Amino acid sequence: NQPVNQPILAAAQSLHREATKWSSKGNDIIAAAKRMALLMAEMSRLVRGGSGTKRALIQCAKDIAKASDEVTRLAKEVAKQCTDKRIRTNLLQVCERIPTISTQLKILSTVKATMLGRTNISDEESEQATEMLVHNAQNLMQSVKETVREAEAASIKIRTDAGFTLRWVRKTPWY
Amino acid sequence: NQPVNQPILAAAQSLHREATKWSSKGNDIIAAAKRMALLMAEMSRLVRGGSGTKRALIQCAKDIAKASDEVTRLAKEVAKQCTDKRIRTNLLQVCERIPTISTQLKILSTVKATMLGRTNISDEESEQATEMLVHNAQNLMQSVKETVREAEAASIKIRTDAGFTLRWVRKTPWYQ
C-alpha cells in the first residue's frame, strides 16, 4: 500500500531477473546479486517513506554498498583467473565502476534522508536529490547485472586447475 | 600557500579567461560570469580547507547558484530575440542545463561542508564527495563559458531595437 518509486523498483527487478536464473550454491555473485536486488526493492519503498525511516534508508544504502563490494572483489578474482583476454578486460571495466557507484549511492541516500527530516527545502533540492539517487540506483543495478553475465563468460576459459572456482548452474525446475 | 583543489581552480580560470575578454558595463551576463569564476576560485580553496569554513562553502555555492540564475535569465531574452537558426537553439539548450547543474552544486556543497573533518565519514565517502563536487563545478564552468560565447554570437542578430540592452565591447590585452 505504501507508495513505491517506479525507477527504483524497475532497476531492482532488472537485476533480480538475471540473478534468479542461477543457483547461489557455489556462486558468490548470485548470493550477493540476489541480496542486492532485494535491498534495492526495499530502497523503493523507503525513499517514499517518511522521516523516521530516514535512518532505515541510510542503512539500506550501506547494505547495498557492502553487497556490491563483495560483487566487485569476486568479479576481479574471476578475471584474474581468465585465459580469454578481451572478455576479462570488459569484466574488469564494468565491475571497477561499482565502488564508485555504490559510494555515490551512500552519499545520495544520506542527503535524501537528511532533507526529509529537515524542514524548508526547495522542491528543487528535494526533486534533484531524488533524481540523482534514482539515476545512481539504475546505474548500479545495470553495472551488477552486466558484471554477473561477464563473470559467467570468464568461467568458460579458466587459467589453471583449481585456483578460483565459480559454479554456473541454471535454476532447477520445481519438479 | 593555502592548499587548493586544482581542477576546481582550473575550471574557474577557464571561465575567467572567456569572461575577461569583454567589459561588464552594459552586459550583466558578463558581470555574473566574472563573479561566478571568482566565487568558483574561492570554492577551490574552501573545499580543500578545514571545518571552520563549512558555512562559507554552503554560502559560496548559494552565491554561485544565484549568479548562474542571472546568467540563465539573461541568456533567455537574448535567445528569444535572435532570429538565428543553428545558433539560437544551441543557446537555449546550453542555458537550460545551468539551473540543474547549480542546484546540484548546492546539494553537493552541503554534503561536503557538514561532513568534512568529522571522523564519522570514511576517507572513501569524503574523496568521492569531493570528486562529485569537482565534476559538477567543471560542468557548470563549461556550461557558462559556452553560454557567454553563444550569447555574444546570438547578439550579432536582433529583430528590433529597444528590446534589451546588451553591450559587447572587447577589453584590450596589455599588448593593446
Swiss-Prot record, chain B:
Transmembrane segments: none annotated. Residues 1-176 are annotated as: C-terminal tail. Phosphorylated; on serines, threonines and tyrosines. Phosphorylation on Tyr-175 in activated platelets affects head-tail interactions and cell spreading but has no effect on actin binding nor on localization to focal adhesion plaques. Changing residue 17 to W: In CMD1W; significantly alters metavinculin-mediated cross-linking of actin filaments. Metavinculin is muscle-specific. It is found in: Cell membrane; Cell junction, Adherens junction; Cell junction, Focal adhesion; Cytoplasm, Cytoskeleton. The modification Phosphotyrosine is found at residue 175. Exhibits self-association properties. Part of a complex composed of THSD1, PTK2/FAK1, TLN1 and VCL. Interacts with APBB1IP and NRAP. Interacts with TLN1. Interacts with CTNNB1 and this interaction is necessary for its localization to the cell-cell junctions and for its function in regulating cell surface expression of E-cadherin. Interacts with SYNM. Interacts with SORBS1. Interacts with CTNNA1. Binds to ACTN4; this interaction triggers conformational changes. Interacts with FLII. Belongs to the vinculin/alpha-catenin family. Actin filament (F-actin)-binding protein involved in cell-matrix adhesion and cell-cell adhesion. Regulates cell-surface E-cadherin expression and potentiates mechanosensing by the E-cadherin complex. May also play important roles in cell morphology and locomotion. It is linked to Cardiomyopathy, dilated, 1W: A disorder characterized by ventricular dilation and impaired systolic function, resulting in congestive heart failure and arrhythmia. Patients are at risk of premature death. Cardiomyopathy, familial hypertrophic, 15: A hereditary heart disorder characterized by ventricular hypertrophy, which is usually asymmetric and often involves the interventricular septum. The symptoms include dyspnea, syncope, collapse, palpitations, and chest pain. They can be readily provoked by exercise. The disorder has inter- and intrafamilial variability ranging from benign to malignant forms with high risk of cardiac failure and sudden cardiac death. This is Vinculin. It comes from Homo sapiens (Human). The chain holds residues 959 to 1134 of 1134 of the full protein.
